[PDB]
């Protein structure tokens, strides 16, 4: 009945020393029934990464929509969109459906190509921006992720350390949520290299 908890799933993003990390689970379900364990919720338009939780039809629709908009941007601007600018585009796009909104919880992660400054942001479904220094959480186990991140996180973690922290934050939060899990992916993002890791986790 509640659109934002039919399909289930989670996204979490963190900042480190000269790096950012974004991670998601792989579950898609019809409430209690698990359907797919290959439903990745993190997309990238150039060097800007977008994670989307919520109603899966909207996750797919918004990915297709932002690919569309960032492609036209690049053709006209003659450069890739930056995280700060993309954040404003997500917000704009969500608020134009204010009275018929997409039931999504988006999360932006990336490094500004010019300044080199790590950047993360979260949104509510009508496009309000949460621009935290530390971490952003989204999905059916947001309460669990807030708990894990708030205790585990410390600032200026090296890329390989930050990986362990965000991974343990997602894994332990997902295991306390019925509608999250069935595998997980973690992106470690540096200025000019990005590593993508699938995590071993319980499949119940």
């Amino acid at each position: 009945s509640d659109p934002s908890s039919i399909n289930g799933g989670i996204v979490v993003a963190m900042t480190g020393k000269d790096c950012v990390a974004i991670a998601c689970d792989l579950r898609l379900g019809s409430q209690s029934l698990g359907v797919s364990n290959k439903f990745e919720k993190i997309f990238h338009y150039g060097h800007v990464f977008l994670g989307i939780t919520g109603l899966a039809t909207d996750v797919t629709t918004l990915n297709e929509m932002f690919r569309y908009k960032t492609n036209l941007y690049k053709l006209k601007e003659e450069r890739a969109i930056e995280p700060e600018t993309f954040t404003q585009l997500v917000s704009s796009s969500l608020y134009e459906r204010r009275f018929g909104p997409y039931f999504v919880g988006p999360v932006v992660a990336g490094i500004n190509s010019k300044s080199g400054k790590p950047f993360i942001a979260g949104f509510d479904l009508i496009g309000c921006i949460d621009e935290a220094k530390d971490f952003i959480v989204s999905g059916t186990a947001s309460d669990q992720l807030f708990g894990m991140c708030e205790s585990l996180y410390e600032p200026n973690l090296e890329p390989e350390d930050l990986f362990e922290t965000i991974s343990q934050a997602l894994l332990n939060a997902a295991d306390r949520d019925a509608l999250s899990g069935w595998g997980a992916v973690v992106y470690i993002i540096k200025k000019d290299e990005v590593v993508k890791r699938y995590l071993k986790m319980r499949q119940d």
Binding site: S4, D124, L125, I126, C128, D130
Partner: peptide, 5 residues
């Protein structure tokens, strides 16, 4: 959900 002082 929305963010709401």
């Amino acid at each position: 959900x929305f963010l709401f002082x």
